[PDB]
Structure formats: C-alpha cells, structure tokens
Design a protein around this ligand. Structure first.
Ligand code: NI
Length: 341
C-alpha cells in the first residue's frame, strides 16, 4: 500500500508510486526521474497515464517498453493542465530528465515536490520566484551538517587533471569509469574530451545514453571498445579483480589502468579536501573514489528552504526511523527561527 508522502491531496495524483499495484483513486501517475527506487513497478503491461519529462519518456519506451499510448511527456518551464489541474515541471539538477513538480490545487494551495534534487541558487530565478508554496515535499538525503562535499565543477577539474597527467606520462594507460544508473555522465564525458577519445561501452549502456538528448552524442560515445581509451564498466567491476580481468581482454594494448568510482558522500569527506584525494593502488592498477553528488549538500538544502519559506515540509528520504525524523524536524525549526518565517 501507497504511503502518505507519495499522495497529492485534493487531486487524483501520485508521485513515484508504481510498486503498490492499482492505487485507489489515482487518475495520473507522475514519475520525477528514471532511477530504480522511483520507477519500481513499471513495464510493458502498464495501462495508466504516466506524466514525466521527454527524456524520462524516451527511457520508459526504450528501456522498460511501456507503450506509447500511456506516455505523456511535458515540456519544462510551461504551465500545463492535467485532468483539470495546473502543473509545471522544473529542472531538478539531478540526473538527465529529472524534474520537480509544481501543483496548483483547485482550493488555492500550491505544492512543490522536489523529487530528487541538487538545490542551486539558479532555482531562485525559475517560475518559483512568482509565488507562495504551502507544502514542500523535500529530498532530505543529506539533511545533517556533517554532509559536506565540493561543487561538481571542482570534482570534474580534479578528474580531468588526474587523467590528463597520467596518460601524458604513460600513453599506454587505459582509463576506466564505473556506472550503475543514469546520472554523473559529466565524469566520463569530460575525461574523454581532454584525452581526444570517444567513450567505449556495452550495447546496453549505449542504448541508455542514446535516450538522453545530449547534444552531439554520436561524436562522443561508441560500442567499439578497441578504438576508445576511456571505457565504461558496471560499478561492481570497479575493484582490483574486475579491472585485472578487464585489462587481460584488451589484447596487450595497455599496461596500466587508472579507474574512477563516482560515489555520493563518504566519511573521508570529513577529513580530506578534494585536492588531497589519493587512490588505492595494487601494481599497475589505481582506483580513485570521487565525491560527485547529484543531491543537495546540507548547506545548499538549507539555503533553498530558507529562500522558499514553505508553510509545511514533508521529507521524502530518511523517513523510516524515529531518530531520523526527529533530527530533520529539529533542523527545519532552526531554519525557520533563524530566517523569521
Ligand atoms: Ni535519484
């Protein structure tokens, strides 16, 4: 059964609610983004209306085979009427195709559902500038002050410089990047661009990238691994055993691997600056863990919320323990007393 924080009161709508069978009263199922925890349940047998972005719609059709007749893509930044209710989709600064949803309820209440997001000051100049929000359904993944990490631009600077230095010292080094979902594509695209290479990958991953409306993509990626000196591998293979096994397959073309594992936050963030990051090394294999986040830091979250001044906040992450719920409620009250709303 569908939990309360996935229902939108006063509408026939749900958000990210496909794992509960037929939800009673639901006339339109919104999908914020193509990540498995959120789409859990969709398939070719789905026969209700799905509302989403263009990019999410391309993925539903090609990767999950949802039939065309049930996919409803909406443009961003545009007032749309759905089943008699005005809605707007906004860029969530999460993975490709990810949105926030603004719902203008028939009774005058305005609701913002963030989906998954990485808050940014640019959101203060979207269509959110114009008006009041009564309820915020918030991505609270990192709602505690210990969760710190650098900007995505600093992380990409570190990865480009690390890869360009290594391959210039040794033209016979291969670079490998881990992946397990959409998102974080800048890591492997920026590294391949500095090395003058296409990115090599499986047919399955190529198919997924072909759904993402990335400009000039045909110039950036390929399934011909032999032509490429940046390879993508499943995240599970990014370890000394998996990488040894991969280097054997490359026909003596390479004598060294440099690998990247994009993670979210890890506790080495509590001590080590991005500059000072060092790899794990065995022989001719080195592995860097880099903290490339597609969720708000504590500080980015707090800024957003203090600017928006919502009347009520409903967390959508970390909701399963009393201690997590209590901790998040305390910070919401500080933020409100500090800013005066
Ligand atoms: Ni996500």
């Amino acid at each position: 059964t569908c939990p309360f924080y996935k229902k939108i009161p006063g509408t026939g709508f749900t958000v990210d609610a496909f794992q509960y069978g037929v939800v009673e009263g639901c006339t339109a199922y919104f999908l914020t983004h193509f990540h498995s925890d959120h789409y859990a349940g969709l398939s070719k047998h789905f026969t209700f209306p799905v509302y989403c972005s263009e990019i999410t719609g391309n993925l539903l059709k090609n990767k999950l085979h949802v039939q065309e007749q049930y996919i409803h893509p909406l443009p961003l930044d545009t007032e749309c009427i759905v089943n008699g209710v005005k809605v707007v989709l906004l860029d969530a600064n999460h993975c490709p195709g990810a949105v926030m949803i603004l719902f203008y309820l028939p009774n005058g209440t305005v609701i913002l559902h963030t989906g998954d997001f990485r808050a940014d000051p640019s959101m203060e100049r979207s269509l959110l500038a114009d008006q009041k929000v009564h309820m915020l359904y918030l991505d609270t993944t990192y709602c505690s002050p210990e969760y710190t990490f650098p900007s995505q631009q600093e992380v990409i600077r570190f990865a480009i410089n690390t890869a360009f230095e290594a391959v210039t010292l040794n033209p016979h080094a291969l670079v490998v990047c881990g992946t397990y979902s959409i998102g974080k594509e800048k890591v492997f695209l920026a590294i391949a661009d500095v090395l003058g290479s296409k990115v090599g990958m499986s047919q399955e991953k190529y198919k997924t990238l072909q759904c993402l409306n990335i400009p000039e993509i045909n110039s950036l990626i390929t399934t011909d691994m032999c032509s490429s000196l940046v390879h993508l591998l499943p995240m599970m293979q990014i370890n000394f055993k998996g990488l040894q096994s991969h280097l054997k397959k490359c026909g003596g073309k390479y004598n060294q691997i440099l690998a990247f594992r994009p993670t979210g936050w890890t506790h080495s963030n509590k001590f080590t600056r991005i500059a000072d990051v060092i790899p794990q090394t065995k022989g001719n294999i080195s592995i860097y863990g880099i903290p490339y986040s597609e969720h708000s830091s504590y500080l980015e979250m707090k800024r957003f919320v203090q600017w928006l001044k919502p009347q009520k906040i409903i967390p959508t992450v970390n909701v399963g323990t009393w201690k997590s719920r209590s901790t998040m409620e305390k910070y919401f009250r500080e933020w409100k007393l500090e800013a005066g709303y």
